[PDB]
Symmetry: C4
């Protein structure tokens, strides 16, 4: 065999965590990533699996996720180190036959566990599966610097914040026509913040945690990463524009409207004011 | 043989896309690149060509481009991934004997197609060929962060924007004496925005799409890339200067004039106000 | 044997210095790093040791550090070059049997010596050992750009500066609940500045040298590095926020309080004003 | 033999140009570098030398430089590409027996020539040799972004600009106690701008070309590079500070004075106002 570390999904996680670390998004253990897998993905690797897979209960039943494997970043683990030791810093987990817990099948060496934002991840997986008829496979959280910065400065109103990000790069509307949901600041790594994130994931493929980070959902690691990067690129242009005293001109409502029409996209109504 | 992936032009595209990705210019699939090739370039590689080359019609006849091969980035494809799988993310295309379409000869695996900005590219190739007696070979579009930022802030007037970029780095005038044309915001990935870009490519080797990006034209990938990088470096100094409250001193008209005279360059008149 | 250069600690120092160089933190010889080792670490390597180990006296007796080996960056040496020649740029030192000096056992080729901030390092090691019952092993100093910038702008008051950094990224409080101590500007590379740093290391795992850099203490190179990076990431968001005219909203006192309670952390009282 | 490309000086030039390219300092062909060599350096490589060495006259006699070899960047050549093809992008030159010209002994393939700032380089070499009793070996010019930005904003007065850079990082004074000279803007790539640069090189190891770049002089490539990086790091902190509305506190005159006394350095008097 090839080792599981050489598999597309372990390699994908290395690539996405490293690229996010490279962006400045993932200081310390900041940020986390989980990718839903199929059985067919992990089964060719059954023989490189854990001494005996450890079971951890879920914070709450998740019957939709019954029998679902994921690969996931570990709690306390640094994005930077994933390329260096993926088996220490990643784990392959598989939720049990009625969504009450999971076995850690591979990785997370030395009694590591899945990310402390696992409630946010798994609950958002659940909603993204229903909301996209199962197409989304990734939930990604990173501390995207400019977006975080903007949360101290822009009205934390889903529609104004969406609209600013649409303006700040032409493509943004096309990439995220549903906009970006904003939560109130919440204590992170809780069931409550994961429920609230999962609820906005019903409506947006991006959700901001003010003064903390962003959560995105996508069909693949690249597309999820690129969703975020697009939101963050815009934030970065906006940071510069605001720091230079603000917009003198920008993309108008009609232009954003002609744009979503050409791209066959339905833009968040409430963000279409002026 | 060596594989085509080892050829100077596939390697050049890997180098230029990767370097642009590295700059922060090419979030997601943002940005695109096409390079005009000669027959002599691709012919030594005829035997590594496509199962059967797929034909796609052009949006409009382009008789100047009859029988011309290009290597081009694919629609939806990420600059970041080109180094990883050039054949998935690039394609070698060759316009047919009367400029009505092209066959995809190599790459663009899995039914990918050339960039959705192909009208902008090919039309601008057409004008750059006439305008430079065939010396330019590259059209490059990227989301150059500081230049985009400046479009929210500087008067979107070709001559004032040119002049600011000349000021923001001494060399700029020498590198782009013809200045940078500015389009009105337009819906991208359209025939109309490609015509309008191609029209300004008559007069400038750089063209700004406000709130979106820049288009440059050059004789080689490095020179085209470096054209852009020079415009963007200046924008970057200007962003900092404006963010610090503005210029207290700058390069004067006479100095810009003595400069274009020493370098044997004829600077855009309308940008020579004060 | 494997060479000592292949050992976890020489490799760790290469990794941490290089990563800091990569961050922009360590222009020229700026910044320095020392890591406390056990005998068991260096002993398997006794046979690759120095021609004859050179003795340098300590600036003052340090009996707690009797018989303790460290690996340390060299005076005048660049973080950038460590990956290139670790034995030229690092040294393994071992304090003597009553804390009056050390022998340079390995590295520091060509009569190099340990960092000129060695008083700061060793004295802070001494206090961090007592303050953490011997868990901290690292002292790291770098010129962390945004934190330095903030020292010209924020009230240099431990509690206001701590509080701003807590606000500037949610996790900060959890990572450094003890806050960051601020020294008056002091002449660096002196016994006085090392005593003063060591004294604040009694109370904080981070200490700012205004208009110069930060000192952090940690159990491991990654954790020490990540402590710093977290403080600096926040500073970086704050720089952007202030540059955009300041905070419109931020994390409130109660939220910071609910946060330190969920994470089982006791946040610096004096920073809990409003 | 080993090839000359593997020699310490070709490797040093690759390392310094690449690192500067990496910093953002050397867009396009911007920036240039020349390193004075000894005969003993190049002689072990005599047998890998040019088809027949081409002679180019000097713009003016330089008898001090008679029989002196240098390795130098080529005109129009990109710092980025040096690591890729050093022999295309670098050249080894040797001034003739009475300082009237040089033979290109190696590199600069395809009729490339030494940098168009060669008057600045060679004249500054001449002054740095006299001013340091022959210790300096490097002249380095790059478009250091923040320093360039500051030239639009700070009074272009040697003593105020020096003083700001001293403030903006503690170490700066120690690294460049002689300060940084400022020229009036001049047309670059001229004898006049090289004379004027060479004249300030009498007094400073750093010289600013406003709205263009910086020139530094050093004993080695690392030390010259690090001189610049230190000046630029400070500029970068200052850019942030000014962009946040300015300094509330900074390093005082007495502190800068105690600093230059501890480090055995004699700080530029005129920069010691307040
Ligand atoms: Zn987080
Ligand atoms: Zn975590
Ligand atoms: Zn675009
Ligand atoms: Zn595209
Ligand atoms: Zn320091
Ligand atoms: Zn040092
Ligand atoms: Zn220059
Ligand atoms: Zn040049």
């Amino acid at each position: 065999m090839q080792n599981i570390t050489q598999s597309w999904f372990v390699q994908g996680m290395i690539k996405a965590t490293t690229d996010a670390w490279l962006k400045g998004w993932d200081e310390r253990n900041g940020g986390n990533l989980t990718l839903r897998l199929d059985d067919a993905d992990i089964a060719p690797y059954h023989d490189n699996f854990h001494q005996q897979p450890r079971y951890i209960p879920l914070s709450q039943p998740m019957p939709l996720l019954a029998n679902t494997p994921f690969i996931v970043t570990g709690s306390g683990k640094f994005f930077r180190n994933v390329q260096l030791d993926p088996m220490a810093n990643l784990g392959i987990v598989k939720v049990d036959s009625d969504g009450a817990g999971y076995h850690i099948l591979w990785g997370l060496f030395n009694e590591a566990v899945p990310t402390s934002e696992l409630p946010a991840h798994f609950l958002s997986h659940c909603e993204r599966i229903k909301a996209t008829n199962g197409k989304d496979r990734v939930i990604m959280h990173c501390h995207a610097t400019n977006l975080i910065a903007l949360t101290y400065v822009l009205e934390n109103d889903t529609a104004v914040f969406t609209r600013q990000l649409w303006e700040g790069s032409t493509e943004c509307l096309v990439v995220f026509p549903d906009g970006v949901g904003i939560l109130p600041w919440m204590v992170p790594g809780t069931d409550a913040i994961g429920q609230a994130t999962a609820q906005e994931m019903q409506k947006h493929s991006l959700v901001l945690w003010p003064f903390h980070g962003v959560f995105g959902s996508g069909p693949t690691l690249d597309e999820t990463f690129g969703l975020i990067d697009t939101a963050e690129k815009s934030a970065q242009v906006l940071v510069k524009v605001y720091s230079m005293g603000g917009m003198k001109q920008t993309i108008s409502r009609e232009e954003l409207i002609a744009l979503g029409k050409r791209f066959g996209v339905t833009p968040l109504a409430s963000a279409l004011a002026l």
